[PDB]
């Protein structure tokens, strides 16, 4: 199945918003923490520092949540989940959950091929 | 770079949804939101905005007050014309101090069991807001009524009780306590009962 065509995806920013000084401490995770320090160079918005997330970085609502394939990801856990996406097969692609086993995945991949339902993580051999 | 000092002071606290969890209130708001925006009537707009209001701001009304204000309208009303429908966005409560009331059509969110009995026993009928929208889709010939709020004990305690001219009730659990100094001329001073404003 081909996805519905949209406008170009812009992605205002690609780099992650990482925590300040997280590279100098193995303790600190890379995830974003708002600096509330009084003399924080990042909080005061100096020129050479790293940026802060805010509203202006939000992505265009037309192309938001759309994956590079052109679909939106909907997590499916068995064969019966594939039947919600029969009418919206050009908008949504199924994402088989990680914990779904190889025995159950065989029936999901077989069914989605006949229904013409895209799977984001099916076997690469099928669909050519 | 625009000089907009005090532009947040211009803005006001306007709520467009109800905090109420009642599903039937949400059906009345759904119905009267449609009527307010699709009809030219100013009745449907006032009713819709009062449905959003909180329980404290939708004060209850008594059956006696409805009877009194409808009689003031009953006089100076032509005999050919029918009496209006009393409409309250709130609760209608019974009054034991009025035994005899006229036959009135009253629409409300809630009627007490005795108020509903008293209205019906006098030849009237207790209406409902979707019943009103079907017989008065624009609110023609109605009486929009409000309950009283100034007699509430919270209102009578609001304000400092120790400033001149203030007759606020003190927040006290003991009535004998807090009665001496600042309350009697003999005991130091007395809070002045009058101030010019």
């Amino acid at each position: 199945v081909k996805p519905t065509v949209s406008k170009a995806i812009v992605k205002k920013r690609t780099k992650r918003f990482t925590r300040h000084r997280y590279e100098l401490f193995p303790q600190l995770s890379s995830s974003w923490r708002k600096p509330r320090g009084e003399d924080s160079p990042v909080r005061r918005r100096y020129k050479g520092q790293k940026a802060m997330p805010n509203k202006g970085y939000g992505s265009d609502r037309a192309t938001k949540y759309i994956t590079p394939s052109g679909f939106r990801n909907f997590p499916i856990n068995n064969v019966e989940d594939l039947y919600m996406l029969v009418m919206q097969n050009r908008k949504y692609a199924g994402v088989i959950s990680h914990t779904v086993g190889a025995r159950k995945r065989k029936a999901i991949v077989r069914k989605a091929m006949e229904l013409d339902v895209r799977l984001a993580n099916g076997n690469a051999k099928l669909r050519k | 770079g625009v000089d907009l000092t005090g532009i947040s002071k211009k803005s006001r606290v306007i709520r467009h949804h109800t905090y109420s969890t009642n599903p039937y209130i949400k059906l009345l708001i759904k119905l009267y939101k449609f009527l307010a925006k699709r009809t030219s009537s100013g009745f449907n707009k006032v009713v819709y905005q009062r449905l959003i209001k909180s329980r404290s701001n939708r004060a209850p009304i008594s059956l006696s007050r409805i009877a009194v204000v409808m009689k003031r309208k009953a006089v100076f009303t032509a005999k050919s014309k029918a009496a209006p429908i009393a409409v309250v966005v709130g609760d209608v409560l019974d009054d034991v101090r009025m035994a005899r009331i006229p036959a009135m059509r009253v629409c409300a969110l809630r009627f007490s069991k005795s108020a509903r009995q008293s209205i019906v026993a006098a030849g009237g009928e207790c209406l409902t807001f979707d019943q009103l929208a079907m017989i008065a889709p624009t609110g023609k010939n109605t009486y929009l009524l409000r309950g009283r709020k100034s007699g509430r004990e919270s209102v009578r305690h609001f304000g400092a009780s120790g400033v001149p001219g203030s007759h606020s009730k003190p927040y006290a659990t003991n009535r004998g306590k807090e009665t001496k100094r600042g309350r009697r001329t003999g005991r130091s001073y007395k809070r002045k009962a009058f101030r010019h404003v």
Binding site: - | V2, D3, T5
Partner: protein, 229 residues
Amino acid sequence: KRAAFKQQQTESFKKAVVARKAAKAALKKTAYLRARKYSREYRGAEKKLVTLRRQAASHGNYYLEAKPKVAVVTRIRGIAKVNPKQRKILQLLRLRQIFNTVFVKMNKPMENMLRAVEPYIAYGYPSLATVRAMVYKRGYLKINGQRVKITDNQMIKDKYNNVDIVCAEDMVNQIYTCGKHFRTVTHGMWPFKLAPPAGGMRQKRRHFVEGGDYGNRDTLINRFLARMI
């Protein structure tokens, strides 16, 4: 087939489309005849003053020009370190941002308002070309509290609901000649938001007669604004 309620709408909308084309032609004809009369008034007024100056000069006399009635005021300073009195005048003049421009009447009450906030503004006496260029290129109306660009005379006719103001030439005439609807026309407009003067200023901190920018330039404001509009 079509539903009954859908058929009534089709007939009702067909008459609205016909009446919309009719009103478009009526206002186009009205705006043509009004603009023809306005342009003839401007030209004859120029010729009358030319002859008066010639008649006065040929007998040793002088001709006194009428004092200007309209001034065009632009804000040439930012929004930092403004005193409370100067701050309020610029708010009452609707000059709350740099390079914001308004038309004002040069009467005694307003002339004493402009003198107090001189270091922040640069005013002068506009010409017909200046008034036309601001209304046509930079003209916006306050419609339902929104800033809407003037794109046809139907918006002008609806915004003002006055027989004397139905077209963009009516707005130009009211501003240029200081008509009876000068305050109606100018208040119903958003303040003009201009670009910085191409080629630059001289010195925003000194008066024009001092070698700067912030005073009254008389009719020299028109070439200052031409680089901005």
